[PDB]
Symmetry: D2
Subunit: 188 residues, 4 copies
């Protein structure tokens, strides 16, 4: 008689926090602007972790939540088991006692057949800005799709309604990401 | 004082015919609808060669020109030197005396760093219809870009003004390509 | 009470001829010196086919039998289905009407998990002379073993008792192989 | 008039210690039995580090010196810069405060074109016991040679005269290595 179209949002997904052993529904983050970052410990970009802490500190009052997703698909730069990831950040790289000031989740794929379902959603929702997907070397997964994540520390912004709004290359500095987010927050 | 914007077309490029040893400017094909196909001898799709002959026969009077570009990047399915390609089609696959009834050019890359410049133009001018770029296996070139050719026997249509109009997956039968071209030709 | 040790020879194996559709037991070749060559159509070494014909002609009276085994594992240089291999040699490479004057068999693996059992025997029976197994590029099979065949047109000699005697690199000219075989035949 | 043949030993080589920033000639180890191990932090075998400490403790009085060589060629399981390797062992894996009780050196290749010269010597001096070199996956270097190291935690014993004596697969437990070394030490 009547068809009601049911629409997809970020709140349809969930993941296991690294530091508890407990599932976190993204419904927790209703009304918040969510920054999803795929992370790794042994990347040149790992140096930006304290910049991510600073971003989160600065913009928490504006309703920004940063979420970090370890992934070993990009140069095999997250080799650690889940229990090893936080100790590696604290004592190896960045080292110096570093602890993320935002929520990290269990390690998993962001591309290919076993990719996490939230990343399918994010990737299908927002195109990557570059025509470059990779080098012969960098692509390690199967199948390969035009909206795949290119590398460690790629980023997605999800609005306060759970619909993805924006995506940055891993090549964009955290400072430029902040500047972009600050200009986006002026709407609200 | 004044800037005149100079615009790119298919007529800006050229290639060496396989059967002469002579360069052919695509200016030759002014006012014609051009079907570019990347070809190979040892692909399952090689079976469609007689369908391409038939397409060309059927639509020559309507101003269609088919152009075939051997390429060894997709499963290494065009291993032959330029002199070996036509004998291979005639005597191996399809065999049976098969001769293409359209112009083939010298073998070269259609993707990656040494890709032919006409294929850069075509690929940048018309998106591929699928989000799937490949398998881990199928991608053999560097760098990898979202508008790369996926496989043997992918196809592009260029209008009578030299601007690319349409692109088909290698998965589309020559019959469906014909049907699509016949519907496009109704405008003229 | 008593154990009798049963010993392995070339006569324990068989393969399907390319040009019949019939199995050939290597027992046929009892009392003969057998030269096994893995072959391909689109290799630089394919040029040596007429040298193999000449070798076979010259040494048939001395009891030499040459056997050719198409294989697609080395640069994917034997892409043809079994029915396409002889036409490819005649009309493509070497071309010119070339027909092998020795027996070719159906195409199959010589290395890795699906290798032909006769090649396991040969490889395990006679070491390769070089410490070099390959480049990162050349090795295409799994698993990888120290006595694997390195490339197209590697060669093994089996004595008149079915025990392998000698193995040549693909880098050895057919002339040097002949010279070596002629010196070996002086024992008999 | 006269040629004197000059012979190669372990004392012809040197490497940079991880924990100093200083070169160590293997001449230091004259008259000692040297156990060379290629090591990594993120391997299943990394668990054997305390077994290596125990081996070294136990057999130091018998003149055994263990030497550890970080290498990132086997599953990319040593991603850390030189400064990160000891902190990773102490705080990540094995973790728990683990410090090696034997000398580790700077990270480098043990196979392929940029392999360390001491490993060329060792590998050329003592064959590996298995015919298996790898999987398609495990081999990451170029060129590939039959005496290459197969994986993390492969081992070589060098006698008190600097000539290599023995080599173990990475598949051999440290307990069996100890048992073998104890039986070898009975000669002296």
């Amino acid at each position: 008689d009547c068809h009601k179209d049911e629409k997809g949002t970020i709140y349809d997904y969930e993941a296991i926090a690294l530091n508890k052993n407990e599932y976190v529904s993204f419904k927790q983050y209703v009304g918040k602007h969510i920054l999803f970052v795929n992370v790794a410990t042994y990347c040149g970009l790992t140096a930006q972790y304290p910049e991510l802490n600073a971003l989160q500190e600065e913009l928490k009052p504006y309703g920004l939540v940063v979420l970090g997703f370890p992934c070993n698909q990009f140069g095999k730069q997250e080799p650690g088991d889940n229990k090893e990831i936080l100790p590696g950040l604290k004592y190896v790289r960045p080292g110096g006692g570093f602890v993320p000031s935002f929520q990290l989740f269990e390690k998993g794929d962001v591309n290919g057949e076993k990719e996490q379902k939230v990343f399918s959603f994010l990737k299908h929702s927002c195109p990557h800005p570059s025509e470059i997907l990779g080098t012969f070397k960098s692509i390690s997964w199967d199948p390969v799709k035009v909206h795949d994540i290119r590398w460690n520390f790629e980023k997605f912004l999800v609005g306060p309604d759970g619909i993805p709004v924006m995506r940055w290359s891993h090549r964009a500095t955290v400072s430029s990401v902040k500047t972009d987010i600050l200009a986006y927050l002026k709407q609200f």
